[PDB]
Assembly symmetry: C3
Homo-oligomer: 353 residues x 3
């Protein structure tokens, strides 16, 4: 029963993995998520405010939902990962409330050995469901995993093909009918509505967050994400980094929190277009971030909210006033994340019943 | 939309700031507050105990209420602070329960440039309200803030004038009618009641707490307090301290927790007379504290509880058996906080209906 | 009122201590316990899953119950401890739910001075009760405590005599009637039931956890455990270790979490036979663990669950594939804990009403 877990040669294309340890998310998790990342989006922070605008109660931060659903997959898929690399085709179907239980099922949809035959990239489609089987989250990710025995031979290889953009039209049925007049701009922390954003606008978030060892471990276990490279200062000595790698998701959550400085009314996340973990983060490193409007979509059947398509780029140890990005055939050396996603935002303020 | 925040030259006397991100405080926050500071006051720790003595449920620790209400003001007032300096005229109007939402409004009531023209002291009156607009917390604080451009000229300057003591008579209507017979001294951890304290009594708390980097960051984000000097190990290199300053409130909470060793039945805080952040705390530094009875007040219209006026002084890296205080024209070098406040305490144990 | 606490010479055999600060355990504590230790046992993690199998709601992790009940005793017994040493005769009478309040009473049942006359071992029987006085936890522990004055003389000395095994027959009335068919092996993360374990089976847990300073302090205060040696980087300089000792219970919780890798369906703990803190853990040290089946007991009056008797041994900085244990007259140098306990596990999967 000694189980070092699954390695790259153990995956067979088209297998469905029915992940263990479904997770009841409570106001315990909300309070710890708030203290690990410091997000200040009022919909999630204030029940009073959420209720007035047309929610039943504050919904979970969409990234608390995401890290929990991802977490459940880690024991089977990425326990023996060296790094999670990217995402595509992400959809937040349903908002999630404290007391709800989240479960995850993954489908192996790609496998590509690395040239050294020491590792492969595993591609999965992961689907999270509430206790009654209703989908709440769908996404694709790919992660670089260890082979147990490098001399082993990779049966079938397949780099799958993924939409680099989700279609706003399928995100329309996500958020319940809201009241954009009840939405109190002063309590939400910005006057800027759907119509105040221009395609091409660039936003430095200014604020920096230095990440301590204990912070990312406490976050990573909260998600019940077991990837040994987060936790084992002994074993990681024998990796390329030689020390504990911070959960990629920790950077996504930190960048989202910072993004409140300019995008406070992008209150909920509807889907993920593309994401890429460019570079790893270590304890003692400082995160900064900057964002861009790529599209501004109206939602078929709705006038309360539209959708912003956004690109957010995070750095370590480098302010983003100069908007760091590409630099030759690759990124500026300070870039650690490049995330392309749809958020929701209120439209008009005219009171209706 | 790139916003480095408000600087000293941006404040205009008499402006009202209506702060963003109102905060629903849950049993998540209570559990994290308990783990960040270790307070052992039974009223807050045990619903069973609170209910018996005449509360509807355990109330929030008054400093969890305080750090949340302060927190909401930080983005507008002290995001660009170098240090929060003092308090006066603090009143805990109403106890607060899990599920309640807290909002903050501040009034700029003072401005004084520093001699180097690099900084000014900003004086505010901050008022926290529940979701229905009822006041729960009022206080005055002053914080040393950065000027964006030092060559800038300060229009109007005003060091306001503040009562160095709150009047017990206005704290009477705070706590609901309690049962001081139901109050179980063994469960509360002290036999000492209102009548067992003498004016002039001095209490060393003995216990020390060493504060790690991750602890104060996790606490400071829980309060959604954004002051860059807490978080940015890069930017703080260019400050006088050259490293992250620990939230002043973290020291107040730690000193209050330690104070359980001698003041266990000073179960709730009614108001704040004067407070002064004497000196900063850094990661790795050890806190100790000692307290003094300054007054013992009966409350107009009540026999269940009286009010102790208390002075609590915290040190770093120095036990308080010698009761460190002043030392010439200024404090003993180890002193970091000097806090003068009213707490509540049960009187007589005679059972009534 | 300056109280450095109780020292070895202050205990009198046969005294009952009625401990202060009873503790309401909430979903705040559950979420923080989950993030401090990362346990993935589905009964505790998923209400949905617990309810289906025959609980009213997820019960508290038995070690969250244990650390809280132990915590309440620390101010009186072990505030001035150098190290907690062992356990015997542990019984989890009743599972515990969020909202319940826990109180502790201890009986001094042993005292033995150390040869240097600087310290003694104090032996206690500690009993935790819900708010209505019903017992939930009973155990014996012994801890090495400081004498205030070494020249002091120890009146009565007594090393009591303790059963090295609890009897499965008295654990039968602990867990409510469950449904072992409703128990979803895929959601619980193991197909192995009562009947799949063999006496003599050995299980390496593979996974390692490196423990940071802030992690054990945040955990130790959550339990409201005050032992100065956990917290005071100044005072601990003058101890044999010269630095902060990590709560022994932190190692028990970490080893239990790791043990999910092979014992996922040992879902609840019924009692503790023997436990020994072999060696201390420090910040930066990495924990690993391995377990053994010692007995497999059926429960008088029940067919849903049986009892496994288990031995789990934790190490620091040494993988357990070689199953480290004894090595001459004493343990392998890497061993830090040797814990002998009864857990519960489902039997047959045949659906009944």
């Amino acid at each position: 029963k000694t189980n070092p877990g699954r390695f790259f040669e153990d995956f067979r294309l088209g297998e469905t993995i029915r992940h263990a340890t479904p997770r009841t998310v409570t106001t315990g998790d909300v309070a710890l998520y708030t203290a690990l990342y410091g997000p200040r989006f009022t919909v999630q922070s204030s029940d009073a405010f959420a209720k007035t605008i047309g929610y039943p109660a504050s919904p979970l931060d969409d990234l608390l939902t995401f890290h929990v659903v991802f977490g459940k997959t880690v024991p089977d898929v990425s326990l023996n990962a060296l790094a999670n690399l990217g995402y595509a085709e992400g959809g937040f179907h349903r908002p999630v409330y404290p007391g709800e239980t989240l479960s995850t099922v993954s489908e192996v949809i790609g496998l590509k050995e690395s040239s050294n035959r020491q590792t492969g990239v595993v591609y999965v489609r992961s689907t999270g469901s509430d206790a009654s089987g209703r989908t709440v989250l769908s996404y694709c990710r790919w992660v670089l995993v260890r082979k147990r025995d490098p001399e082993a031979k990779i049966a079938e290889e397949h780099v799958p093909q993924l939409a680099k953009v989700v279609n706003p039209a399928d995100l329309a049925h996500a958020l319940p009918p809201l009241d954009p007049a009840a939405y109190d701009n002063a309590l939400a922390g910005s006057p800027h509505r759907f119509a105040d954003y221009a395609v091409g606008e660039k936003i430095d978030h200014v604020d920096g967050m230095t990440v301590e060892e204990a912070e990312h471990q406490i976050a990573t276990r909260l998600f019940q994400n077991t990837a040994k490279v987060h936790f084992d200062a002994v074993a990681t000595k024998e990796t390329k980094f030689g020390k504990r790698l911070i959960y990629g998701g920790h950077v996504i959550s930190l960048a989202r929190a910072l993004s409140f400085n300019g995008l406070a009314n992008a209150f909920a996340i509807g889907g993920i277009n593309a994401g890429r973990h460019v570079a790893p983060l270590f304890a003692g490193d400082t995160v900064y971030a900057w964002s861009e409007v790529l599209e501004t979509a109206e939602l078929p059947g709705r006038s309360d909210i539209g959708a912003l398509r956004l690109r957010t780029v995070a750095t370590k140890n480098q302010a983003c006033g100069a908007y760091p990005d590409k630099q030759g055939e690759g990124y500026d050396p300070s870039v650690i994340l490049d995330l392309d996603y749809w958020a929701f935002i209120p439209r008009l303020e005219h009171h209706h019943h």
